[PDB]
Write a protein that binds this ligand. Sequence first.
Ligand SMILES: COC(=O)C[C@](O)(CCCC(C)(C)O)C(=O)O[C@@H]1C(OC)=C[C@]23CCCN2CCc2cc4c(cc2[C@H]13)OCO4
Ligand SMILES: [Cl-]
Ligand SMILES: [Cl-]
Ligand SMILES: [K+]
Ligand SMILES: [Mg+2]
Ligand SMILES: [Mg+2]
Ligand SMILES: [Mg+2]
Ligand SMILES: [Mg+2]
Ligand SMILES: [Mg+2]
Ligand SMILES: [Mg+2]
Ligand SMILES: [Mg+2]
Ligand SMILES: [Mg+2]
Ligand SMILES: [Mg+2]
Ligand SMILES: [Mg+2]
Ligand SMILES: [Mg+2]
Ligand SMILES: [Mg+2]
Ligand SMILES: [Mg+2]
Ligand SMILES: [Mg+2]
Ligand SMILES: [Mg+2]
Ligand SMILES: [Mg+2]
Ligand SMILES: [Mg+2]
Ligand SMILES: [Mg+2]
Ligand SMILES: [Mg+2]
Ligand SMILES: [Mg+2]
Ligand SMILES: [Mg+2]
Ligand code: NA
Ligand code: NA
Ligand code: NA
Ligand code: NA
Ligand code: NA
Ligand code: NA
Ligand code: NA
Ligand code: NA
Ligand code: NA
Ligand code: NA
Ligand code: NA
Ligand code: NA
Ligand code: NA
Ligand code: NA
Ligand code: NA
Ligand code: NA
Ligand code: NA
Ligand SMILES: [Sr+2]
Ligand SMILES: [Sr+2]
Ligand SMILES: [Sr+2]
Ligand SMILES: [Sr+2]
Ligand SMILES: [Sr+2]
Ligand SMILES: [Sr+2]
Ligand SMILES: [Sr+2]
Ligand SMILES: [Sr+2]
Ligand SMILES: [Sr+2]
Ligand SMILES: [Sr+2]
Ligand SMILES: [Sr+2]
Ligand SMILES: [Sr+2]
Ligand SMILES: [Sr+2]
Ligand SMILES: [Sr+2]
Ligand SMILES: [Sr+2]
Ligand SMILES: [Sr+2]
Ligand SMILES: [Sr+2]
Ligand SMILES: [Sr+2]
Ligand SMILES: [Sr+2]
Ligand SMILES: [Sr+2]
Ligand SMILES: [Sr+2]
Ligand SMILES: [Sr+2]
Ligand SMILES: [Sr+2]
Ligand SMILES: [Sr+2]
Ligand SMILES: [Sr+2]
Ligand SMILES: [Sr+2]
Ligand SMILES: [Sr+2]
Ligand SMILES: [Sr+2]
Ligand SMILES: [Sr+2]
Ligand SMILES: [Sr+2]
Ligand SMILES: [Sr+2]
Ligand SMILES: [Sr+2]
Ligand SMILES: [Sr+2]
Ligand SMILES: [Sr+2]
Ligand SMILES: [Sr+2]
Lengths: 132, 337, 53
Amino acid sequence: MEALGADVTQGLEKGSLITCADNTGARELKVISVHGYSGTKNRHPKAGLGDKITVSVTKGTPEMRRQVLEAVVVRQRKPIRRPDGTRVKFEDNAAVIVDENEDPRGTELKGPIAREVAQRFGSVASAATMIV
Amino acid sequence: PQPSRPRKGSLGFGPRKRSTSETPRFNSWPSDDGQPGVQGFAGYKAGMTHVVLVNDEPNSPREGMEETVPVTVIETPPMRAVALRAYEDTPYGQRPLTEVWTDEFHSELDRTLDVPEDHDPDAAEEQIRDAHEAGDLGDLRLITHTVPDAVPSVPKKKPDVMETRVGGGSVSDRLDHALDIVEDGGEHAMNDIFRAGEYADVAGVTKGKGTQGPVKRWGVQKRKGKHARQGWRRRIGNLGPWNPSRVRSTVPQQGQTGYHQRTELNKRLIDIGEGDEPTVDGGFVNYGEVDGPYTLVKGSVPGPDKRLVRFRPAVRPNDQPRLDPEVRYVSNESNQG
Amino acid sequence: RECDYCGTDIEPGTGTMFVHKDGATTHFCSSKCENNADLGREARNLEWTDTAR
RNA sequence: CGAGUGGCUUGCUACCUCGAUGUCGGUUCCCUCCAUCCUGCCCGUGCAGAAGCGGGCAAGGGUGAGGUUGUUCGCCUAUUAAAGGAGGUCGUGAGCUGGGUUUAGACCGUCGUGAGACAGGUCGGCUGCUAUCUACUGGGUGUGUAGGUGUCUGACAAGAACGACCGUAUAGUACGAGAGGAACUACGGUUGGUGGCCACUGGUGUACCGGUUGUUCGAGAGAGCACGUGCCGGGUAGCCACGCCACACGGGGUAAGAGCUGAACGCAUCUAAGCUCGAAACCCACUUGGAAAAGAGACACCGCCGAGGUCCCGCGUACAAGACGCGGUCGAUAGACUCGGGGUGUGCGCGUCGAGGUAACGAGACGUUAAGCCCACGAGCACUAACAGACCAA
RNA sequence: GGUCUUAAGGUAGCGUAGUACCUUGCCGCAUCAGUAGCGGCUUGCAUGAAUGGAUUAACCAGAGCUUCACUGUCCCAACGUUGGGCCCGGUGAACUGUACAUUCCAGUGCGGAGUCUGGAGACACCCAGGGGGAAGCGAAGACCCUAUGGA
RNA sequence: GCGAAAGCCAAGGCCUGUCGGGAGCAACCAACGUUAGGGAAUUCGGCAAGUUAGUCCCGUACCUUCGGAAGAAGGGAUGCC
RNA sequence: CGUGGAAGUCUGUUAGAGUUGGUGUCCUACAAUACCCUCUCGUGAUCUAUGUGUAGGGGUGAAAGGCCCAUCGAGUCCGGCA
Ligand SMILES: COC(=O)C[C@](O)(CCCC(C)(C)O)C(=O)O[C@@H]1C(OC)=C[C@]23CCCN2CCc2cc4c(cc2[C@H]13)OCO4
Ligand SMILES: [Cl-]
Ligand SMILES: [Cl-]
Ligand SMILES: [K+]
Ligand SMILES: [Mg+2]
Ligand SMILES: [Mg+2]
Ligand SMILES: [Mg+2]
Ligand SMILES: [Mg+2]
Ligand SMILES: [Mg+2]
Ligand SMILES: [Mg+2]
Ligand SMILES: [Mg+2]
Ligand SMILES: [Mg+2]
Ligand SMILES: [Mg+2]
Ligand SMILES: [Mg+2]
Ligand SMILES: [Mg+2]
Ligand SMILES: [Mg+2]
Ligand SMILES: [Mg+2]
Ligand SMILES: [Mg+2]
Ligand SMILES: [Mg+2]
Ligand SMILES: [Mg+2]
Ligand SMILES: [Mg+2]
Ligand SMILES: [Mg+2]
Ligand SMILES: [Mg+2]
Ligand SMILES: [Mg+2]
Ligand SMILES: [Mg+2]
Ligand code: NA
Ligand code: NA
Ligand code: NA
Ligand code: NA
Ligand code: NA
Ligand code: NA
Ligand code: NA
Ligand code: NA
Ligand code: NA
Ligand code: NA
Ligand code: NA
Ligand code: NA
Ligand code: NA
Ligand code: NA
Ligand code: NA
Ligand code: NA
Ligand code: NA
Ligand SMILES: [Sr+2]
Ligand SMILES: [Sr+2]
Ligand SMILES: [Sr+2]
Ligand SMILES: [Sr+2]
Ligand SMILES: [Sr+2]
Ligand SMILES: [Sr+2]
Ligand SMILES: [Sr+2]
Ligand SMILES: [Sr+2]
Ligand SMILES: [Sr+2]
Ligand SMILES: [Sr+2]
Ligand SMILES: [Sr+2]
Ligand SMILES: [Sr+2]
Ligand SMILES: [Sr+2]
Ligand SMILES: [Sr+2]
Ligand SMILES: [Sr+2]
Ligand SMILES: [Sr+2]
Ligand SMILES: [Sr+2]
Ligand SMILES: [Sr+2]
Ligand SMILES: [Sr+2]
Ligand SMILES: [Sr+2]
Ligand SMILES: [Sr+2]
Ligand SMILES: [Sr+2]
Ligand SMILES: [Sr+2]
Ligand SMILES: [Sr+2]
Ligand SMILES: [Sr+2]
Ligand SMILES: [Sr+2]
Ligand SMILES: [Sr+2]
Ligand SMILES: [Sr+2]
Ligand SMILES: [Sr+2]
Ligand SMILES: [Sr+2]
Ligand SMILES: [Sr+2]
Ligand SMILES: [Sr+2]
Ligand SMILES: [Sr+2]
Ligand SMILES: [Sr+2]
Ligand SMILES: [Sr+2]
């Protein structure tokens, strides 16, 4: 993929329960896989800020629940490193549901986004209220 | 069918034993290209700080912006090239022929060597030239030492002697270039060989850790789950199969870790200067204060503070030289805190 | 820059930036300041802090 | 239908062990095979392109995470370049695990008159030993080569030190009616592996500072105990990874293959002689070890009555013993002291205030006080201790 | 089949069961995915009425499954604490020992060799280590068969 | 303090649960503390560890043999002067 | 609403009894059945000291072929017996 412009320490794993930062009807997301990733023996597949991940809807509306959808990691608790050395960390771990062409499934996005995610996934940026 | 997995640690840095010389010895030298010159220098590790720098890379989306880069401060005072050794091409490889020494020696060099009182620098020079005429001359290298006396933080006064190659032009012109450096008094600085922004290969004898187990030494797993409570925590599963009925040297075992020679490739020289510009407040921890000739190497460098590190122009660079990087800021913040 | 907690000048190429739930941004100079903030303490009440003196 | 190769399955045999070679599965760690799943280079195509199908060379590297099941096997999910198979006593219990098989207890079904049985199911049900030899990982002492110091050489040896993917430009281009849709090349990044390092972020930090509960020293002050910190909060150095740095290109010779010239055989022919090319594979390049390489090495200087080394002493860039490295007054090696740089968070005492209370008394607040206390780092500083002196040696 | 054996011919219930071979039975629940678990169906290889059937509140160091919470069980390991370990004084065993013994790769041999054959490698001694091999040490195999054995 | 509980301390007893000296004291082992982000992905199985916790107030489901379930669950409070 | 204070009743390392898991430590042991944490019972079919009775094809057994002095699908000793 295109360079993020920040060094990420993947804060999530396969099976991690995260927040769904949108109005799709999905409240909680569970990480299943991480796009383009291949690990090593015994290693739990790791996901971080800027990654396109596959998720299952744990909590939400009856229609959205149980569905296997693709998402993009927007916020994470574990720090990331910006080129000026500064570390940036968030209050929660969050993702936004995305389609085949990487366009957000919902219309409105809840909470902030990292500027590096915005640059990589453009249509998610032009839906973001706050970009930090 | 039991998952595949790469082996624990590399087999190319073996045998994992204590180094013979604390002074690193390069096993390779750069290719002969342009003008003649000494193919290396040496300093003493001081510690680390960070530098705010302007992006030099033309292919970066951040070209011209401020970037924070980690830097290892190494004190690089002038060294003395006290002799010129010449090698001859024999059917058994390169063997040393003769050495051309000086008259002017450093006051405290007698702590390591048996300083020459009676030598003939002309008969030696003659033997080397008769060999060049015969087409038997191999390469030309200089016997060089450091002046630890110039560095107040390093306790030693006993010089670290090492051989360094001279490459560049023709064998005739680099013989003459070599003899000129020597006959003066041998004094040369980091500037004579290196320019800020060039890629150098730093060689050093690592931080000694004494004896450590397979987990630390080879990166093997600790015993997991139930296996961790049975009496075995940091011991490997087995020393090998039933057959072959011997323990193969490739199996991860205990022993000496650290105090090995490593040659760290492609290290960018951020800045070469003089003064107290990179010194940390309160002094570098376990080292001291820097106020003299220094070099700022990008990232980490093998060995602890006070150790002798060696420099050589990169034998295999990946990137093109982007000379004299713009240093916006150098951190002087205390390393304690 | 200046620390949004204590008030000292954050040494460049150092520190952490905490992004709150609402979007608010808080620059910290060290872990000490982050930890005092998590304890619910306000910088004005601690004497060692520049915002206090 | 015919001919075979292997020795993973199964069957057969009864050669070996019944004065015992510990049974499945799993795990962990190492090596290997090729009948190749991916990756490199190729040939064919029912090869437009894209995506495929089939075949050849090729074992360098990779081949991962999970849900049911003791399972091997297998079924299933999402990822992936791919998530290949097999051997090493069905590798691996003087390594682990003990879920299954297969003791002694018990139940159910079936069988039996019965004891009791079952190649049926089910609950429970133990894991010994101080390493003599050998083997290897690391560490020393001697001898050989035949005075010492310093610098090297390189026979050999090890490596995967690198593997792979995504994205951008190429390009909405070549190709194609359209749908759809590449490449060479140049770039940016990710992943796995590898080696090193701690400025930064993070962990630790029973150094240290503070808060505070119970109890004891009459109160105060200041302390002990509460498991090897009572608990809580912060945390320096160091050590660390979750942090940071580095890890080519190119040559040379080949395989499959594409060809040139060319004869046997006037022609033709990539081959028989000759030659130009051509794989992630081989050699070199690069990193690490390596004078015990018995052809036991080279060079320079010093010295043979003295060069050098050991002991000794103060110490670590070193360290389980041993070894290694540095300093030793012509000195900053260690300690004290004072600064600097850091940790904590405002000391004792006194003064003002303080809900109240006749008063006694009074939790606490403010000031004095960026206070007090403390530091595994640095600098200054010969004050203290590196003194005295011994020995070997051509 | 629309009686025959041998007296009767399985009624209430329960049922893929601690009983179901086929079997991971079929449908559903739950999970990304569930040989598990629960519900339903159920022709039950070979359920069933004091050989007691069914059911059940309460109880349980009893067997299986799910959720919330929690966490070094794991990703993936780090640093620290105490006692050992290591060096020194003192005390001072045992297991085991046909002999020889510096081995390695192949081969051969009663077909699972440090000792045979061919090569390769190999200067001696010592320290620490984790246990690959000595089909390591410990126990005249409890399995299996055999004995005109025992109980 | 509910307490013959913990923890601390008297009276009384003891330094004889009877070998010591040394090395920031390495690997490895036994007991154990703390670990960022994730949170059972571990494993036959949460085995091991951890979480919760005393007291008062509020409040409390299915089912039931009416006894129980029940401290269900869940929520709030808690010092000193 | 109070009184009353029942119970093979509950919590409980009270004393005391027991022994689920760690398949931890030990496994030439401290110990021929031990150590630590965890766990169960603790007014009753309770626990316990002493005295006393039952004896080997016999006892005793809330039954595991358990136990009858480290000895049990028939104790131990000596004899039969070389
Ligand atoms: C039926 O299986 C057994 O009986 C196992 C055991 O009893 C294990 C004994 C372990 C000891 C007590 C000797 O440590 C035994 O003696 O095994 C023999 C045994 O004991 C030495 C070894 C044997 C002999 C040939 C090799 N084999 C290895 C182990 C084994 C495993 C078996 C087996 C036989 C053997 C024998 O039957 C199938 O599973
Ligand atoms: Cl995955
Ligand atoms: Cl393990
Ligand atoms: K046998
Ligand atoms: Mg696994
Ligand atoms: Mg620091
Ligand atoms: Mg800081
Ligand atoms: Mg064995
Ligand atoms: Mg082939
Ligand atoms: Mg291979
Ligand atoms: Mg096996
Ligand atoms: Mg074994
Ligand atoms: Mg065993
Ligand atoms: Mg053992
Ligand atoms: Mg079972
Ligand atoms: Mg069982
Ligand atoms: Mg069922
Ligand atoms: Mg009846
Ligand atoms: Mg026998
Ligand atoms: Mg039998
Ligand atoms: Mg009989
Ligand atoms: Mg954690
Ligand atoms: Mg698993
Ligand atoms: Mg438990
Ligand atoms: Mg009695
Ligand atoms: Na053990
Ligand atoms: Na074995
Ligand atoms: Na065959
Ligand atoms: Na096994
Ligand atoms: Na391969
Ligand atoms: Na499986
Ligand atoms: Na075997
Ligand atoms: Na075992
Ligand atoms: Na096993
Ligand atoms: Na080539
Ligand atoms: Na019946
Ligand atoms: Na832990
Ligand atoms: Na062994
Ligand atoms: Na009444
Ligand atoms: Na117990
Ligand atoms: Na009971
Ligand atoms: Na009898
Ligand atoms: Sr050299
Ligand atoms: Sr070399
Ligand atoms: Sr065990
Ligand atoms: Sr063998
Ligand atoms: Sr082949
Ligand atoms: Sr392929
Ligand atoms: Sr099998
Ligand atoms: Sr099957
Ligand atoms: Sr295998
Ligand atoms: Sr079975
Ligand atoms: Sr059976
Ligand atoms: Sr069992
Ligand atoms: Sr000799
Ligand atoms: Sr493209
Ligand atoms: Sr299109
Ligand atoms: Sr204490
Ligand atoms: Sr508490
Ligand atoms: Sr050819
Ligand atoms: Sr020699
Ligand atoms: Sr019926
Ligand atoms: Sr040992
Ligand atoms: Sr026996
Ligand atoms: Sr007393
Ligand atoms: Sr005594
Ligand atoms: Sr802490
Ligand atoms: Sr689970
Ligand atoms: Sr699982
Ligand atoms: Sr509550
Ligand atoms: Sr009771
Ligand atoms: Sr058990
Ligand atoms: Sr013990
Ligand atoms: Sr035992
Ligand atoms: Sr425990
Ligand atoms: Sr009780
Ligand atoms: Sr007799």
